[PDB]
Design a protein around this nucleic acid. Structure first.
Length: 537
RNA sequence: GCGGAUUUAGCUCAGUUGGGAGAGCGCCAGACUGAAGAUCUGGAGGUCCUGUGUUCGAUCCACAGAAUUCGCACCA
């Protein structure tokens, strides 16, 4: 049976999600005055195109944003961000938004216990209290659309707005081949295989499942299946016969430390469900791009072609070869460049997606382009310390932490991890490597301060232009840099430097404590008296 | 700057107390070289520092007036 776009009521426990399901069971069936229920053991489930009162899944824990994945991104195509009508913001309510919108999963914020604030309101009538946890509008983002928790009402108005959000995403169902499904909640135990409650979104399960864990990936043998029925049964027999659009307790003892992020499927067909299996491990991720600065030299070949009698005989040949293809007589050997690209590691799915959204944007080399070359949801690894050492980068961790082996590897590489930064976001660091003083190249900045000694507009054994002698004591008063010389703060003149004319000494660069005469620009428009010459790139 | 101070072929030098500018490298072939070409030779290049105290010879040193290397003034 084709699944309606499901919600789950994500958010903090008893922020109206837990209290929703417990009363939902009893209330909904009366409160609709209509049917269209597709109830399953998982929660209380009723289809989206019922003209009154609709709700879907419960995750009896808290979070369910990454738990409820499917083959487009989430299975909860519309997600409910559960805030309480009584009490605003709680932690998992805001994680649900980030993970969903950044992963392009439409969002309902259904501040639950809807009856209790804004007087049993509809979709667009709870807004004040609903916006307490952020709401936006339709699309992959969050519209405030409401479902209650202590009555079956307001849920009619869930249907209305929620479907228009749901439009963008939906991964349907079948009662055929192997199953697809995700975990609604899956309990975490090491050294035990605890049961996994799942929304089986598509396909048929008998009693076999496959899950990911905080241990390892494994393919469990279920002891039994137990499920509420939509109903259509592939097998009417004593428990088997799961279809898509079903919630299923998958009871299996080969289950590991399966998180609420994994999926619970089954594969016994791979001519359809392999292509659903792949896809339903994702809804955590996005993209980054950046580019790096390099070296090249067209001299290491053309210089070599020249005279010397062997090389001349070669030269007659080289010219002929060049005519055929320019790349043919080349004998260049230019090499090596480094900037500082970094490696990104993160652990919260909405967080990495957020970092990625900012990061992909930066790929423009103003004068440098610097961000991450690699990102992943994981832990710091051997690769990350290697990356830091090679480019002259550093390891950017969100809150991931570094294991024992990577730390040893880090020491050998002569680098050390930065993680748990505060703010934990890596985009600030990545944008510091980017631009900082890199696009400054005509901008003023003291980086070549010196004091003006004199000028030799007048004779000094040679009468010249307004050649200003200056004692360099910071950076370089050189003809490369520009200047703004300040009498004490009042600019005398500002321009570039294009002279080194003197009569005592002439030097390419006036550095350190050396005095050399250079007119600042060519001549000077006010000369003699002054103090600091800020040379600026 | 000033100078000490060369003064003086393009520059450099000599011609010089005061009787031609000695010749040359940057022009130049021979020469040379393995050939090439400068050599050597001698010529192209002779502003005579500038112009002059000075001049039968001032072409010189020297000065009319000014420039400069840097000790020195400057150098702080």
């Amino acid at each position: 049976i084709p699944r309606s776009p499901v919600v789950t009521i994500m958010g903090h426990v008893d922020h109206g999600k837990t209290t929703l399901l417990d009363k939902l069971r009893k209330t909904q069936v009366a409160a609709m005055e209509a049917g269209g229920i597709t109830q399953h053991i998982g929660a209380f489930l009723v289809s989206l195109p019922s003209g009154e009162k609709i709700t879907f899944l419960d995750t009896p824990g808290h979070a369910a944003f990454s738990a409820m994945r499917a083959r487009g991104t989430q299975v909860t195509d519309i997600v409910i961000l559960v805030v309480a009508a009584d009490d605003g913001v709680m932690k998992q309510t805001v994680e649900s938004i980030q993970h969903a919108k950044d992963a392009h999963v439409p969002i309902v914020l259904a501040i639950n216990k809807c009856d209790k604030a804004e007087a049993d309101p509809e979709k667009v009538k709870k807004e004040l209290l609903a916006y307490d946890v952020v709401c936006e509008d339709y699309g992959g983002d969050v519209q405030a659309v409401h479902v209650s928790a202590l009555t079956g009402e307001n849920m009619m108005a869930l249907a209305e707005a929620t479907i228009a959000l749901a439009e963008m995403l939906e991964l349907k169902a079948d009662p055929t081949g192997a199953v697809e499904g995700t975990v609604i909640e899956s309990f975490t135990d090491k050294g035990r295989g605890p049961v996994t409650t799942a929304i089986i979104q598509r396909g048929t399960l008998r009693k076999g499942s496959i899950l990911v864990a905080g241990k390892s990936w494994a393919k469990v043998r279920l002891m039994f299946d137990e499920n509420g029925r939509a109903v259509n049964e592939a097998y009417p027999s004593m428990p088997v016969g799961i279809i898509g659009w079903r919630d299923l307790p998958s009871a299996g003892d080969e289950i590991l430390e399966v998180e609420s992020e994994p999926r619970a499927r089954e594969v016994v067909d791979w001519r359809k469900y392999e292509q659903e299996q792949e896809k339903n491990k994702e809804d955590l991720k996005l993209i980054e791009e950046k580019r790096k600065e390099h070296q090249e030299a067209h001299r290491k070949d053309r210089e070599k072609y020249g005279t010397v009698h062997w090389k001349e005989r070669s030269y007659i040949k080289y010219r002929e070869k060049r005519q055929q293809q320019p790349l043919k007589p080349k004998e260049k050997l230019e090499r090596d460049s480094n900037v500082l690209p970094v490696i990104v590691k993160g652990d919260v799915d909405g967080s990495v997606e957020a970092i990625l959204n900012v990061m992909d944007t930066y790929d423009a080399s103003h004068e440098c382009e610097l961000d991450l070359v690699h990102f992943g949801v994981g832990d710091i690894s051997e690769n990350d310390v290697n990356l830091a050492e090679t480019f002259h980068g550093v390891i950017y961790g969100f809150n991931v932490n570094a294991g024992n082996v990577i730390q040893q590897l880090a020491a050998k590489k002569g680098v050390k991890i930065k993680l748990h930064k505060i703010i934990y976001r890596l985009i600030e660091d990545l944008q510091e490597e980017l631009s900082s003083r890199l696009p400054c190249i005509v901008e003023e900045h003291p980086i070549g301060e010196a004091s003006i000694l004199a000028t030799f507009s007048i004779t000094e054994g040679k009468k010249k232009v307004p050649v200003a002698g200056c004692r360099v004591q910071k950076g370089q008063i050189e003809k490369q840099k520009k200047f703004k010389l300040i009498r004490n703060g009042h600019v005398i003149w500002k321009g570039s430097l294009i002279s080194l004319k003197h009569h005592k000494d002439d030097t390419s660069v006036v550095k350190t404590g050396m005095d050399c005469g250079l007119s600042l620009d060519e001549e000077k428009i006010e000369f003699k008296v002054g103090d600091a010459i800020i040379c600026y790139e």
